[PDB]
Design a protein around this ligand. Sequence first.
Ligand SMILES: [Cl-]
Lengths: 76, 167
Amino acid sequence: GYDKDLCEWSMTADQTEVETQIEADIMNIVKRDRPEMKAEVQKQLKSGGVMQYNYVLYCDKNFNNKNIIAEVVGEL
Amino acid sequence: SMAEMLRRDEGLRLKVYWDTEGYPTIGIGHLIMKQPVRDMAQINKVLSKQVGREITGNPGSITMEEATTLFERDLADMQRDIKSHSKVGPVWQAVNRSRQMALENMAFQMGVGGVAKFNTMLTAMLAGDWEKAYKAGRDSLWYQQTKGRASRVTMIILTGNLESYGV
Ligand SMILES: [Cl-]
């Protein structure tokens, strides 16, 4: 998604604050849509990183954030 | 484009952050130093030479134009290396542009030397055995540890197109 305030903030704010926001936003979608995938998502965020999702979540009008689960864990 | 592909997989930062290994990073996956250094005087000193002007800030910051310039140089360096590598190069030369992008995406993530470790996958790509290549990519620790990205990238290797990136 594109969010004018979160786009630029996510590019510039301290990493710890940004990762807290990214991780909360992902985990809220997981809990709503595929709650059983929580442990898998947590595992991937720890092994693969959190910061890289800032662009698709907040800077990209062509990315629908409902698809962030598959973005982290793969299709289906 | 590789810019659009790697902006998606690496994110976009105008201020330093530290990757999963503790290494200072900025822009589109631009590694500043392959060392777990947090000292901002030292990070900014190295980044100033890489960008070409004095970086300031705790953490250091760049402009969007500088992030693009770092990316273009990083991409070119990686493409130089992948084509001249005695194992990966022959494979890159033998597949279509989409599968080239998949290999370049992996090399951007793990280095051309990391890609060279995928013997079974590379051999299968040279044979045109895309299902075997896909299965070998998905059988890897790389897939276990960055599963979303490995999924999208191996889907290219299987299908020969970029629809796993929405193209
Ligand atoms: Cl949503």
